[PDB]
Amino acid sequence: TIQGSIVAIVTPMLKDGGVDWKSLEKLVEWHIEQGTNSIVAVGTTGEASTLSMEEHTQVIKEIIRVANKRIPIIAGTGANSTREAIELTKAAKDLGADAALLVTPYYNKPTQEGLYQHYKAIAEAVELPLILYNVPGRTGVDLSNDTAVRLAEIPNIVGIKDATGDVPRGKALIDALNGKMAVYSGDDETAWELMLLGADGNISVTANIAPKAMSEVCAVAIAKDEQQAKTLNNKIANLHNILFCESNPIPVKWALHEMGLIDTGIRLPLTPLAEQYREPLRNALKDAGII
Amino acid sequence: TIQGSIVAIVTPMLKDGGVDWKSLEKLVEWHIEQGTNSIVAVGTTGEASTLSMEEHTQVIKEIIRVANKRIPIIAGTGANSTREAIELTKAAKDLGADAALLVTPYYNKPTQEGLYQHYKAIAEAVELPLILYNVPGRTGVDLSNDTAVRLAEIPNIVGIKDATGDVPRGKALIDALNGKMAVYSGDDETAWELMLLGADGNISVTANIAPKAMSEVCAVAIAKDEQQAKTLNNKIANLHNILFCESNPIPVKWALHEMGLIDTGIRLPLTPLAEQYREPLRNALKDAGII
Numbered sequence A, B: 001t002i003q004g005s006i007v008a009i010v011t012p013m014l015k016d017g018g019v020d021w022k023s024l025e026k027l028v029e030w031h032i033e034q035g036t037n038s039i040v041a042v043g044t045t046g047e048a049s050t051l052s053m054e055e056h057t058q059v060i061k062e063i064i065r066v067a068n069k070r071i072p073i074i075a076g077t078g079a080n081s082t083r084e085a086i087e088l089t090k091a092a093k094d095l096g097a098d099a100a101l102l103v104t105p106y107y108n109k110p111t112q113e114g115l116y117q118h119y120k121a122i123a124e125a126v127e128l129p130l131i132l133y134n135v136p137g138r139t140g141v142d143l144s145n146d147t148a149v150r151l152a153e154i155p156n157i158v159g160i161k162d163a164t165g166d167v168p169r170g171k172a173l174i175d176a177l178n179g180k181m182a183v184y185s186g187d188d189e190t191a192w193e194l195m196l197l198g199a200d201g202n203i204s205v206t207a208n209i210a211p212k213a214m215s216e217v218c219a220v221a222i223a224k225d226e227q228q229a230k231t232l233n234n235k236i237a238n239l240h241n242i243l244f245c246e247s248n249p250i251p252v253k254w255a256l257h258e259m260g261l262i263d264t265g266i267r268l269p270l271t272p273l274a275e276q277y278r279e280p281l282r283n284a285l286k287d288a289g290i291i
């Protein structure tokens, strides 16, 4: 049921790396004003990895408070420990989050059965809608369509963020499932095509700097308007490319800085976008009319 | 500079997941007895990602207590947060660890420069020998030989665990380093080859079940006795392959259970060795004279 443009929102930071609450606040308000359908708080793009548990809670709480029930909020609550994922997802629920996005355990490479048992355990432990999140390139594991299909049987497992960018496989996944659970794109550059094939939305990086354009692209692709989905995407297709010239969220945070929306803060081991890409990005933002 | 067989020790668990302190004590004792040259406490093989911070500290504490200065203890203290890694590495230092092993930040994909700044920051914050650890298949990031050479200039960065299993690449690493830091194998199958090439040791998974054998293999290869290192390694070569039928430490823990040394405990998302693999493992263990 949650659909359209879902922004994986950055966690604005002060020069020293402290969370910049006033920028965070303005961003959320802007996304709501601009058309953004919902926000994933503290996901990969929001630097889940470098924020303390206390900061995860603080950030989730502020985004919910500022949203004021106008759009649904998803809390990023993934962990590579089943026990810890349970704790983070429970905390998200108690905070009133509408759903939780859970990346597959990264680094420790669990088996498919383990991924199955991991998710099942969380779903039975916390009574909240859970969205799976597969991004093999970052985690070391690949949650198969088959395993996702098995998980779709659990009532509170309501979707999956497929960041593979493998359109054929995403379509295969969509078809293998029925409205059993939703499928969200996690790859901005092929998102439009995924939604045209039935995905319910796009958990976007690009929606961070072009919330309305992406808002529109999703509405149109979900309505199966291929031609208008193609020409509305072409206008921002370049953005989809440069926002990953270095690992996300490095580029998108610098973009947001060139837009005057946030400061340069960014936490190690991540680093400020290398000088090498700042100008080509400034030009990409101009070419798209962002600035 | 630590040299030889360095066991990446498992952390024994009771059926319900609780750390089996008694078995751990017995294993540490056994390793010292059998010829193990060093122990890595709470590394990947020790399920560092599913142990609480307190259990982390406790495992290091116990291993150090039992070892009683007989052999150097390395503490696994890697994190994908620079702040977090410094905290864990200071802790290890204050606990009496001889060095710390830090895997490259996983999941969040820092740049090469981010990797350099991450490790540099930790080196300067904690006066303790640090060993880098590159295992691209688990982390989603590959610390290049160039970035390694850079880091080797730093006084207390004393070594690198190269888990690529790419010997020619390791040859190039050993050569480019000009001795500035040690190189350790993180791939049991090719460890004897990397050591014959100049590696100072093997942070081994196999040493968990064949410590006497891996200890001689290491000493002989480090001495550059190619014929004896090959024939000694040939006797345990099938183990290096079987111990990875599923993701480590899933197989080595079960092997150790078949040996009657530990219980079946393992924490989700990890799972006990799949049935189909238990017998073949038992046989390899029998052929190697372990069982």
Ligand SMILES: N[C@@H](CCCC[NH3+])C(=O)O
Pocket: A109, B044, B135, B137, B138, B163, B244, B245, B246, B247, B248, B249
């Ligand atoms: N630590 C080893 C274990 C994985 C087991 C593969 N089946 C690695 O990085 O590859």
